[PDB]
Amino acid sequence: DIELTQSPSSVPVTLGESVSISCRSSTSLLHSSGKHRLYWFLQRPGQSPQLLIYYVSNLASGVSDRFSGSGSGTDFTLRISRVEAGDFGVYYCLQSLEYPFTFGSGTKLEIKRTVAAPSVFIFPPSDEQLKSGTASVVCLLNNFYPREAKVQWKVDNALQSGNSQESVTEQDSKDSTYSLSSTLTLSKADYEKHKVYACEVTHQGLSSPVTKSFNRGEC
Amino acid sequence: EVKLQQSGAELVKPGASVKLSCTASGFNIKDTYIHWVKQRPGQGLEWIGRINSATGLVKYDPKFQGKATITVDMYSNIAYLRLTSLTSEDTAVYYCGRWTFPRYFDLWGAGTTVTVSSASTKGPSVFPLAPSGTAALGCLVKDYFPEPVTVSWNSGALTSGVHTFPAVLQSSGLYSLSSVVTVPSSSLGTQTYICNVNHKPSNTKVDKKVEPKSC
Numbered sequence: 351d352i353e354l355t356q357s358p359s360s361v362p363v364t365l366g367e368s369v370s371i372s373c374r375s376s377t378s379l380l381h382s383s384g385k386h387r388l389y390w391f392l393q394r395p396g397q398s399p400q401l402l403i404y405y406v407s408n409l410a411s412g413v414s415d416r417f418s419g420s421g422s423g424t425d426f427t428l429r430i431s432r433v434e435a436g437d438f439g440v441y442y443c444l445q446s447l448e449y450p451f452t453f454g455s456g457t458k459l460e461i462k463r464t465v466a467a468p469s470v471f472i473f474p475p476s477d478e479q480l481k482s483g484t485a486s487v488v489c490l491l492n493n494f495y496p497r498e499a500k501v502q503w504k505v506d507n508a509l510q511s512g513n514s515q516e517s518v519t520e521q522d523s524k525d526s527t528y529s530l531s532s533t534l535t536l537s538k539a540d541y542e543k544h545k546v547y548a549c550e551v552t553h554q555g556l557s558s559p560v561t562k563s564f565n566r567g568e569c
Numbered sequence: 570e571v572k573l574q575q576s577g578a579e580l581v582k583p584g585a586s587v588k589l590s591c592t593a594s595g596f597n598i599k600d601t602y603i604h605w606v607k608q609r610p611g612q613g614l615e616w617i618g619r620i621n622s623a624t625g626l627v628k629y630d631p632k633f634q635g636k637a638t639i640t641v642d643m644y645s646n647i648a649y650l651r652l653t654s655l656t657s658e659d660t661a662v663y664y665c666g667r668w669t670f671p672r673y674f675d676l677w678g679a680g681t682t683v684t685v686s687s688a689s690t691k692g693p694s695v696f697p698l699a700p701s702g703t704a705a706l707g708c709l710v711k712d713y714f715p716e717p718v719t720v721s722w723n724s725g726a727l728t729s730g731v732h733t734f735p736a737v738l739q740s741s742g743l744y745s746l747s748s749v750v751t752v753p754s755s756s757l758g759t760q761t762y763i764c765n766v767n768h769k770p771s772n773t774k775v776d777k778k779v780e781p782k783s784c
């Protein structure tokens with residue numbers, strides 16, 4: 351098979367700056383027609399692949415002219431000038447010279463933006479859940495940068511541990527920030543036993559840690 | 570107006586077979602080559618093969634010969650991918666895409682999620698994350714298997730400020746996620762907020778109103 355190497359695996363680029371990424375083939379992609387049989391695709395998060403460039407240099411119908419390509423023989427380059435938040439995703443090259451057609455392993459575009467502190471929100475468990483015997487307490491860190499953050503749970507001032515997990519979004523398609531959810535799971539009995547539920551957030555955008563808390567029953 | 574519509578998510582047993590569909594509308598599938606692409610969770614795109622819809626002839630990546638069979642029904646406007654002797658390596662999203670001489674790779678389906686498992690499906694429990702300038706509210710989508718779930722807000726009328734989190738596994742071997750949205754605090758007494766949660770493997774669809782807390 352023809353092998354396509356995409357190096358590096360991840361490149362960071364600042365909003366509004368240009369970037370170049372590489373696809374190198376194990377053999378020449380020159381077809382007898384005089385076309386080089388290489389394509390570029392963008393896969394945004396949760397989406398199908400989207401064609402950007404055909405045959406090295408040709409802009410696909412409906413694609414921004416911020417995207418261009420060049421190269422010959424074995425080394426090809428996609429260029430994105432004035433990178434926008436919407437360009438976040440993974441770029442894949444594909445060769446059509448020989449069957450089987452083959453993809454490169456893909457280059458993730460990381461978008462650099464300014465530091466941003468999280469907005470922090472805490473949610474008690476729903477009365478509907480409590481009837482089922484389980485209590486889930488949720489802590490939301492909204493629209494922050496960079497990705498690193500620490501969430502500690504405390505119940506009546508007792509530092510919790512072992513009884514929580516979290517999820518982080520990929521970089522936002524509009525503003526290139528992250529958001530993070532942390533869920534504390536306890537048993538109806540435990541939750542009914544204790545008063546003060548607190549989420550303590552540490553992030554480099556904050557001059558000191560932020561705590562959001564509620565007292566059970568006190569609405 | 571031209572579209573490829575792929576079949577729903579499937580939970581299938583190890584050793585069994587599955588057949589995925591890719592339906593053309595707004596064009597005649599016989600005028601196109603149909604490509605199938607695999608993507609295992611968190612991995613890259615893998616070319617499976619492609620069928621000439623006018624002739625039925627297929628090219629395959631030999632890594633899949635004896636597991637993958639691409640076919641086309643010219644009359645019904647549908648292409649298919651059949652996978653046999655399923656293993657956990659076949660858990661993935663499968664995309665279909667067309668190619669023509671004038672437009673190249675200009676059209677893809679939204680992908681079909683296939684999960685190969687001995688385990689039975691579980692549908693989600695949906696709970697409100699009730700709101701406290703800007704307010705946050707949401708829905709907790711708890712204890713389902715397999716992926717994926719879909720979440721919308723107000724039947725898709727509300728897109729701005731929504732964040733639907735990646736699923737995480739619990740120690741139970743079941744997935745959980747949350748979807749949140751930030752809204753003007755002034756809308757809390759006026760505007761209704763409903764999360765719409767669908768899970769095809771469990772034949773689950775739920776709508777949960779999220780409204781200010783209590784007292």
Ligand SMILES: N[C@@H](Cc1cc(=O)oc2cc(O)ccc12)C(=O)O
Nearest residue numbers: 387446447602603604619620668669
């Ligand atoms: N005679 C060609 C036509 C073709 C079919 C296709 O599915 O994809 C393509 C991609 C190309 O960049 C060029 C030609 C094709 C062939 O069977 O390979």
